[PDB]
Protein backbone atom coordinates (compact mmCIF):
# COMPACT_ATOMS: atom_id res chain seq x y z
CA UNK A 1 0.00 0.00 0.00
CA UNK A 2 3.15 2.35 0.68
CA UNK A 3 4.57 1.84 -3.36
CA UNK A 4 0.77 2.68 -4.29
CA UNK A 5 0.07 6.13 -2.12
CA UNK A 6 3.45 7.74 -4.10
CA UNK A 7 2.17 5.76 -7.42
CA UNK A 8 -0.92 8.15 -7.27
CA UNK A 9 0.77 11.64 -5.52
CA UNK A 10 2.85 12.00 -8.82
CA UNK A 11 0.27 11.58 -11.27
CA UNK A 12 -1.81 13.41 -8.97
CA UNK A 13 1.23 16.30 -9.08
CA UNK A 14 1.08 15.93 -12.83
CA UNK A 15 -2.15 16.37 -13.08
CA UNK A 16 -2.55 19.15 -11.39
CA UNK A 17 0.48 21.00 -12.81
CA UNK A 18 -1.81 20.43 -16.09
CA UNK A 19 -4.40 22.16 -14.23
CA UNK A 20 -2.72 24.95 -13.20
CA UNK A 21 -0.92 25.75 -16.33
CA UNK A 22 -4.73 25.79 -18.33
CA UNK A 23 -6.42 27.25 -15.60
CA UNK A 24 -3.32 30.06 -15.11
CA UNK A 25 -3.84 30.27 -19.14
CA UNK A 26 -7.45 30.31 -18.93
CA UNK A 27 -7.56 33.18 -15.93
CA UNK A 28 -5.12 35.39 -18.14
CA UNK A 29 -7.78 35.38 -20.97
CA UNK A 30 -10.42 36.02 -18.02
CA UNK A 31 -7.71 39.05 -16.99
CA UNK A 32 -7.62 40.41 -20.37
CA UNK A 33 -11.66 40.10 -21.09
CA UNK A 34 -13.33 40.73 -18.13
CA UNK A 35 -12.16 43.18 -15.51
CA UNK A 36 -13.82 45.59 -18.31
CA UNK A 37 -17.13 43.72 -18.08
CA UNK A 38 -17.26 44.10 -14.40
CA UNK A 39 -16.57 47.65 -14.37
CA UNK A 40 -19.07 48.23 -16.74
CA UNK A 41 -21.60 46.22 -14.78
CA UNK A 42 -20.43 48.57 -11.70
CA UNK A 43 -21.38 51.54 -13.47
CA UNK A 44 -24.70 50.22 -13.99
CA UNK A 45 -25.59 49.42 -10.25
CA UNK A 46 -23.91 53.19 -10.48
CA UNK A 47 -26.36 54.51 -12.52
CA UNK A 48 -29.54 57.06 -10.77
CA UNK A 49 -32.92 57.20 -11.10
CA UNK A 50 -33.33 60.54 -12.38
CA UNK A 51 -30.58 60.35 -15.05
CA UNK A 52 -32.59 57.37 -16.84
CA UNK A 53 -36.22 58.71 -15.87
CA UNK A 54 -35.69 62.35 -17.30
CA UNK A 55 -34.85 60.80 -20.52
CA UNK A 56 -36.90 57.91 -20.72
CA UNK A 57 -39.77 60.41 -20.53
CA UNK A 58 -38.19 62.23 -23.54
CA UNK A 59 -40.26 63.59 -26.76
CA UNK A 60 -37.87 62.38 -29.25
CA UNK A 61 -34.91 60.34 -29.14
CA UNK A 62 -31.34 61.67 -30.09
CA UNK A 63 -29.40 59.79 -32.72
CA UNK A 64 -26.56 58.18 -30.66
CA UNK A 65 -28.65 57.42 -27.92
CA UNK A 66 -31.11 55.48 -30.22
CA UNK A 67 -28.35 54.20 -32.08
CA UNK A 68 -26.53 52.30 -28.69
CA UNK A 69 -30.24 51.56 -27.30
CA UNK A 70 -32.09 49.76 -29.87
CA UNK A 71 -30.11 46.65 -30.25
CA UNK A 72 -29.29 45.92 -26.50
CA UNK A 73 -33.27 45.29 -27.20
CA UNK A 74 -32.70 42.89 -29.37
CA UNK A 75 -29.93 41.42 -26.96
CA UNK A 76 -32.77 41.83 -24.63
CA UNK A 77 -35.71 39.81 -26.00
CA UNK A 78 -38.24 42.32 -27.50
CA UNK A 79 -36.74 43.02 -30.75
CA UNK A 80 -38.05 46.00 -31.04
CA UNK A 81 -36.49 48.58 -33.05
CA UNK A 82 -40.00 50.51 -31.40
CA UNK A 83 -39.08 53.95 -29.39
CA UNK A 84 -42.70 52.62 -27.60
CA UNK A 85 -41.41 49.51 -27.11
CA UNK A 86 -38.14 50.76 -25.46
CA UNK A 87 -40.27 52.87 -23.22
CA UNK A 88 -42.66 50.24 -22.23
CA UNK A 89 -39.73 47.61 -21.66
CA UNK A 90 -37.33 50.37 -20.14
CA UNK A 91 -40.05 51.74 -18.14
CA UNK A 92 -40.15 48.86 -15.62
CA UNK A 93 -38.85 48.64 -12.22
CA UNK A 94 -37.49 45.06 -12.56
CA UNK A 95 -35.21 46.71 -14.77
CA UNK A 96 -33.10 48.23 -12.13
CA UNK A 97 -32.91 43.92 -11.40
CA UNK A 98 -32.18 43.49 -15.02
CA UNK A 99 -29.64 45.75 -15.17
CA UNK A 100 -26.94 43.47 -13.92
CA UNK A 101 -28.63 40.81 -14.53
CA UNK A 102 -27.72 39.32 -18.28
CA UNK A 103 -24.70 37.23 -19.01
CA UNK A 104 -22.62 36.53 -22.09
CA UNK A 105 -22.99 32.52 -22.95
CA UNK A 106 -26.45 33.55 -23.40
CA UNK A 107 -25.90 35.64 -26.73
CA UNK A 108 -26.66 34.29 -30.05
CA UNK A 109 -24.40 34.61 -33.44
CA UNK A 110 -26.77 35.87 -35.55
CA UNK A 111 -27.01 38.66 -33.03
CA UNK A 112 -23.42 38.59 -32.42
CA UNK A 113 -22.91 39.46 -36.50
CA UNK A 114 -25.89 42.07 -36.54
CA UNK A 115 -24.69 43.62 -33.37
CA UNK A 116 -21.15 43.71 -35.20
CA UNK A 117 -22.71 45.27 -38.33
CA UNK A 118 -24.27 47.38 -36.43
CA UNK A 119 -21.05 48.47 -34.47
CA UNK A 120 -19.89 48.93 -38.27
CA UNK A 121 -22.63 50.99 -38.84
CA UNK A 122 -21.99 52.94 -35.61
CA UNK A 123 -18.56 52.34 -35.13
CA UNK A 124 -18.26 56.56 -34.79
CA UNK A 125 -21.14 56.82 -32.90
CA UNK A 126 -19.79 53.62 -30.38
CA UNK A 127 -17.73 55.86 -28.02
CA UNK A 128 -17.89 55.55 -24.66
CA UNK A 129 -16.41 59.74 -24.05
CA UNK A 130 -18.39 60.55 -27.24
CA UNK A 131 -22.07 58.98 -26.03
CA UNK A 132 -21.41 60.29 -22.08
CA UNK A 133 -22.24 63.99 -23.42
CA UNK A 134 -25.85 62.89 -24.62
CA UNK A 135 -26.47 61.62 -21.42
CA UNK A 136 -24.57 61.00 -17.95
CA UNK A 137 -26.94 58.21 -17.99
CA UNK A 138 -25.06 56.40 -21.35
CA UNK A 139 -21.60 56.35 -21.15
CA UNK A 140 -21.46 53.24 -18.63
CA UNK A 141 -23.75 51.18 -21.18
CA UNK A 142 -21.77 51.86 -23.88
CA UNK A 143 -18.52 49.65 -22.94
CA UNK A 144 -21.28 47.77 -21.48
CA UNK A 145 -22.17 46.02 -25.06
CA UNK A 146 -18.62 46.25 -26.42
CA UNK A 147 -17.60 43.69 -23.30
CA UNK A 148 -20.31 41.37 -23.61
CA UNK A 149 -19.54 40.30 -27.04
CA UNK A 150 -16.07 40.59 -26.63
CA UNK A 151 -16.13 37.47 -24.53
CA UNK A 152 -18.96 35.88 -26.74
CA UNK A 153 -17.30 34.24 -29.76
CA UNK A 154 -13.93 34.37 -27.74
CA UNK A 155 -15.59 32.53 -25.16
CA UNK A 156 -16.44 29.67 -27.45
CA UNK A 157 -12.62 29.63 -27.47
CA UNK A 158 -12.73 29.12 -23.62
CA UNK A 159 -15.43 26.56 -23.88
CA UNK A 160 -13.11 23.41 -25.48
CA UNK A 161 -10.46 24.46 -22.79
CA UNK A 162 -12.84 25.27 -19.80
CA UNK A 163 -14.56 21.33 -20.34
CA UNK A 164 -11.67 20.23 -20.69
CA UNK A 165 -10.58 21.69 -17.30
CA UNK A 166 -13.65 20.10 -15.91
CA UNK A 167 -12.49 16.78 -16.86
CA UNK A 168 -9.46 17.24 -15.30
CA UNK A 169 -10.55 19.11 -12.33
CA UNK A 170 -13.26 16.46 -11.58
CA UNK A 171 -10.86 13.56 -11.99
CA UNK A 172 -8.27 15.37 -9.89
CA UNK A 173 -10.34 15.00 -6.75
CA UNK A 174 -12.12 12.09 -7.64
CA UNK A 175 -8.49 10.75 -7.52
CA UNK A 176 -7.85 12.36 -4.24
CA UNK A 177 -10.31 10.92 -2.39
CA UNK A 178 -9.38 7.81 -3.41
CA UNK A 179 -5.28 8.74 -2.71
CA UNK A 180 -6.60 9.67 1.40
CA UNK A 181 -9.06 6.17 1.74
CA UNK A 182 -5.16 4.64 1.10
CA UNK A 183 -3.50 6.91 3.52
CA UNK A 184 -6.27 5.94 6.06
CA UNK A 185 -5.65 2.11 5.74
CA UNK A 186 -1.77 2.36 5.72
CA UNK A 187 -2.18 4.31 9.57
CA UNK A 188 -4.99 1.95 10.29
CA UNK A 189 -2.32 -0.94 9.93
CA UNK A 190 0.40 1.13 11.94
CA UNK A 191 -1.82 1.16 14.51
CA UNK A 192 -2.95 -2.35 14.28
CA UNK A 193 0.22 -3.86 14.17
CA UNK A 194 1.65 -1.98 17.25
Given at each position: ???E??????????????????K??????????????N?A?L???????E?L?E??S?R?P??????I??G?L????????S?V?????????G???????????????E?R??????????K???????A?????????????V?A?????????????????????ES?LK??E?R??K??E???????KV?
Open positions: QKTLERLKHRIAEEVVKIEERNKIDDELKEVQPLVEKAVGNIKPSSIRLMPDVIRDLEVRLMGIFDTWSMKSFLAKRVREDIATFDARNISKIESVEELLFKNGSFDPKNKRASTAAAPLAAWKNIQYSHVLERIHPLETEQAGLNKTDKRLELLNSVGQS
